[PDB]
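Box 4.2: Ligand-aware structure prediction
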Amino acid sequence: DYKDDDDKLDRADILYNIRQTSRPDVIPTQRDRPVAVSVSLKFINILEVNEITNEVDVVFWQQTTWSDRTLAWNSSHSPDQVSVPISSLWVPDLAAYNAISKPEVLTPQLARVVSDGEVLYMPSIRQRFSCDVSGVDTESGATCRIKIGSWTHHSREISVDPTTENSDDSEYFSQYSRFEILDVTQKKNSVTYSCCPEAYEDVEVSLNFRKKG
Amino acid sequence: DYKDDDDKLDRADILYNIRQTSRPDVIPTQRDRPVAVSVSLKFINILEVNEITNEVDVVFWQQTTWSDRTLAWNSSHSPDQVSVPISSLWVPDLAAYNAISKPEVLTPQLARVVSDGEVLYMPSIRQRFSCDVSGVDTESGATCRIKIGSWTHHSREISVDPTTENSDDSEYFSQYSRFEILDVTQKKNSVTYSCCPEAYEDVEVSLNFRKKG
Amino acid sequence: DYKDDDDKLDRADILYNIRQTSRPDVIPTQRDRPVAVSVSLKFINILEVNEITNEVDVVFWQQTTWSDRTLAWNSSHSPDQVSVPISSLWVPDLAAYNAISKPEVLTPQLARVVSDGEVLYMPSIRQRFSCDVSGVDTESGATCRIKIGSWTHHSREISVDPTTENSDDSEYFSQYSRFEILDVTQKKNSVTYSCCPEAYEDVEVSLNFRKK
Amino acid sequence: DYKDDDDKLDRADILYNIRQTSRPDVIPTQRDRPVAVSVSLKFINILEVNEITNEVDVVFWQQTTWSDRTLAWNSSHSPDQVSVPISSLWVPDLAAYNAISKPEVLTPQLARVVSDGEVLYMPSIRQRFSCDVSGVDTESGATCRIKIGSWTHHSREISVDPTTENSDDSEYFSQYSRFEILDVTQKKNSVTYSCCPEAYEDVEVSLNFRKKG
Amino acid sequence: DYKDDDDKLDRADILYNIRQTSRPDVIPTQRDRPVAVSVSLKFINILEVNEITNEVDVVFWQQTTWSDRTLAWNSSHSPDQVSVPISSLWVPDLAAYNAISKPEVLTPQLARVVSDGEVLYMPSIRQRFSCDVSGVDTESGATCRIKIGSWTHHSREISVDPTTENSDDSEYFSQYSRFEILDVTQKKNSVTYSCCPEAYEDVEVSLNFRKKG
Ligand SMILES: Nc1nc(-c2ccc(O)cc2)cc(N(Cc2ccccn2)Cc2ccccn2)n1
Ligand SMILES: Nc1nc(-c2ccc(O)cc2)cc(N(Cc2ccccn2)Cc2ccccn2)n1
Ligand SMILES: Nc1nc(-c2ccc(O)cc2)cc(N(Cc2ccccn2)Cc2ccccn2)n1
Ligand SMILES: Nc1nc(-c2ccc(O)cc2)cc(N(Cc2ccccn2)Cc2ccccn2)n1
Ligand SMILES: Nc1nc(-c2ccc(O)cc2)cc(N(Cc2ccccn2)Cc2ccccn2)n1
Ligand SMILES: *[C@@H]1O[C@H](CO)[C@@H](O)[C@H](O)[C@H]1NC(C)=O
Ligand SMILES: *[C@@H]1O[C@H](CO)[C@@H](O)[C@H](O)[C@H]1NC(C)=O
Ligand SMILES: *[C@@H]1O[C@H](CO)[C@@H](O)[C@H](O)[C@H]1NC(C)=O
Ligand SMILES: *[C@@H]1O[C@H](CO)[C@@H](O)[C@H](O)[C@H]1NC(C)=O
Ligand SMILES: *[C@@H]1O[C@H](CO)[C@@H](O)[C@H](O)[C@H]1NC(C)=O
């Protein structure tokens, strides 16, 4: 009930309920099924690209959501949603497999827990990757391939599900960038290695971009 | 009253009361209305500026207020205000939407709590932004916009409001800066996304400045 | 039982068990024998190189395993493995003896504990080293040696066992790098000092690489 | 009693007593008057100077004292002083008002507590400032001024006093700097703002220096 | 004895005894005499040398030992040594008096505690220094002096004593550095200031090095 959203004690009790139920270190696997983690990046900017090193700086909003039904409550007469520090929640152990720098999180480390058990988490992140930035000054542009998946959970435990959607890019990418976006695709992928046969699901995010002009 | 300001025991007890009552993770919505958060940036210095890449590096005192009547106390014969570590208080989850570096806090992380429940928090912050830097070498100057709002609380839950609409920050801006501030305007602004319909309020700050001839 | 892998309560119970049993600060020596730690670096990228100062800046996945049998459980009808924050576990105090920068860990700091007591830990690390960069612009390439071993545990306490394989890390190394890996090999070595006769085992990693 | 300094049990007991009595978050006012804080900067090095940007990068020892006579003990047969982590103590919430970078503390964060309740704190700090570097390469030199005061406590609560008005920091400043110090002067003022009537005290440090030749 | 070194229960009990007994914030003075701290820097690399600014950036292993007999135990049929997190131990508050950057620790922060109560601690540290760099390009090389001592403990509480006085660090220094070490000498030194009477002991490390030709 949105009318009850600003009931302070209601919010405090939901938070208390969330923290009691939450097992921040245990994957929330409903029904003997992998946790489905939906992710999609919204690029905000492309910063220091170096063609002498093949490195780029990106800023993106990591739209991330999953379900934990044990967190659900009755919101007939209480807030529909509250904000919760992620230290009180299980959060998927996502990583950019091919990153070359730490994720620099630029935003308050809070998620939204919806009364149905849905969790929404969208950090703004600056991070460096190794990219093919050779044709960045040409009309065909450059490509970054960013791969994001669970660092330690294989596909029986965590499933990673991407959403490619370029229509709303305009709402996100800075208009003052040295660069423009030709194309973003975010595709579901599976990773295996010679040593280790189990499949790890990831989103492969392809950023095709070039200098304006 | 200010005759009792330096009563050590009083301050200690006020701090104790604040801590017992304070819920650092719950928005202090009094009645059933959004928390009104007032924000005003006083710019202190423009350190670096890149016209080619449209980035700025600035220092600013972020004057921040809101009130939590539950923290209030009768101060006829006690301190009117004390200093409180913000780890003991709720603070709004503000983020600069077009920031490209972590805000670097340069000051003790303390807030002032007033006996009427008003909270004042003014961190000195250094941070980088993507904004319009063109015109910096002209008489008219560049106009750089900085949008700041709550990261996770929509307008039903938090309202952001600019304190001052203008100023030049002459009481604040360094006289030794290679730049000079022409004007600073602060404006209420609203943001929505086509994925997510609820409105998030923000203050949009416009910094009109230029290089010294 | 992999069919039980997703039994949430099972997982939570395993984790609680692991935490009750685990001594994060004590080496898990079994049968009064040294802890065998297998290490394996998989290079992700080589970022910058200075032939004048003999420095390299690299990113690598450090494949690390060891056993702690006291953590073992019967998985007849429960998960085969769980993820565990390494703050809850003993991890070997490994260091690169020729690092000239701090190990910048890029990944979530978790290990896998397997029901037989096996622990797998694989941080992605960016770090700078001092090593031989001569020949980086020749077709033989440079050969940069990186030495990693325990910082405080001598060889009767921790033994380091380099493993397979011999490869150019093709499944791992970025194709977008300005460098190519010719070869990566690993070798067991030992270190002693005239102040300190006890032997410290290390893996010696030889990175043979050149500029494109 | 200096004969008793190395009595371990005594030291431990003193530290226990200090921690039991200490209120790290409460200003140690005595007799309902402002905490008197003595501050003095001993400059060690001037690293980088930029006359275009008016920035300096310096290293100094911040000599800092104040009294909390509640920490005092009878040292007739016990150590005169002990070292205490400052997290176990109240420390003034000092900040450089014209700092453009975080204070980098280079030394163990320890204070000395004296049996008479005197507290001595001296971090080595490297920090960048916005100040006057006009004339760095003249024989008269540049006079860079730094203001340091409490961030959240007005003059009725904390008073900040320079210690020795003038020296040339002979026993401190690196003989290997490419700059030389002509004079350092430290004087009281106060700062007020039209928004905020109450007065904040600070020490204003004037650093007169030039490049050697 | 070493045949019991891998007795896990024993190690655990030793670590438990050490933690029960240890006072990490109190100097381990025995016999009411100053704590004897032995220090020697083994240099690993000389990364950067600046002759215009007289700065030096090095990596060294700070070999450090002292004794706390209260930690001792009977090792007839138990381990002779264990590794201990330095957070559980008292460590001397050492600082480089001419450091201009924070000591960056590159190694696990663990010490060895021997059953006779000796403590060994050897962090690899990367740090920057202001020191005399003139002559680095000559045959005689540069002699860069580094002074390390307790930050808050004077001569009656802590005595710093150089271990080896002369070495070329040939077992430690990288063969791959562009510099080479002619000699490393370490001398006991003492330091006082006009403001403050009592003496502070330190080790003067003279690093005589030059560019390879
Ligand atoms: N553009 C946008 N996208 C999402 C989102 C999130 C998850 C997802 O799977 C898909 C979309 C959420 C979202 N907001 C809410 C929210 C929730 C949590 C953290 C942060 N924010 C609103 C919002 C407005 C303004 C600034 C930041 N967030 N805004
Ligand atoms: N110029 C100025 N503005 C404010 C202020 C704060 C919040 C707000 O909404 C509007 C104005 C407070 C303020 N001071 C007090 C205070 C209080 C809290 C934290 C920090 N400081 C005085 C002050 C002087 C000098 C250095 C820092 N603070 N000074
Ligand atoms: N290539 C690879 N190697 C290993 C590995 C680990 C230890 C060892 O001794 C040898 C090899 C494990 C491993 N994964 C599992 C795991 C486990 C623990 C932490 C992290 N990851 C799968 C995996 C795929 C992709 C991204 C991260 N992990 N992948
Ligand atoms: N030159 C100097 N000045 C002071 C000092 C401090 C406060 C003050 O108001 C005036 C002078 C203290 C002091 N030492 C003692 C002390 C005490 C506490 C922390 C740190 N140090 C001795 C000392 C020697 C050498 C390296 C560091 N300290 N040395
Ligand atoms: N060369 C060397 N010197 C020392 C040492 C230590 C203290 C001292 O006063 C003098 C010398 C100890 C030492 N090791 C053991 C130890 C113990 C503790 C921490 C770290 N290391 C062996 C060792 C081998 C290899 C890599 C690191 N340590 N190695
Ligand atoms: C809780 O939800 C149930 C399910 O619709 C409903 O029957 C009940 O009235 C709700 N509780 C209230 C409104 O207090
Ligand atoms: C509290 O109530 C009023 C102030 O609103 C005042 O008249 C009264 O004396 C106060 N009592 C106290 C401070 O104990
Ligand atoms: C555990 O393992 C034993 C054999 O080691 C097996 O017989 C028993 O059924 C198992 N118990 C469980 C899974 O509870
Ligand atoms: C402190 O103790 C000594 C003896 O223990 C005594 O002589 C002295 O008077 C005491 N001082 C006070 C203030 O009690
Ligand atoms: C204690 O030490 C003595 C001699 O050092 C030895 O005989 C005895 O066995 C030891 N007792 C233990 C380790 O319990």
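In the box above, the bound molecule is 2-acetamido-2-deoxy-beta-D-glucopyranose. Chains D and A do not touch (no CB pair under 8 Å).
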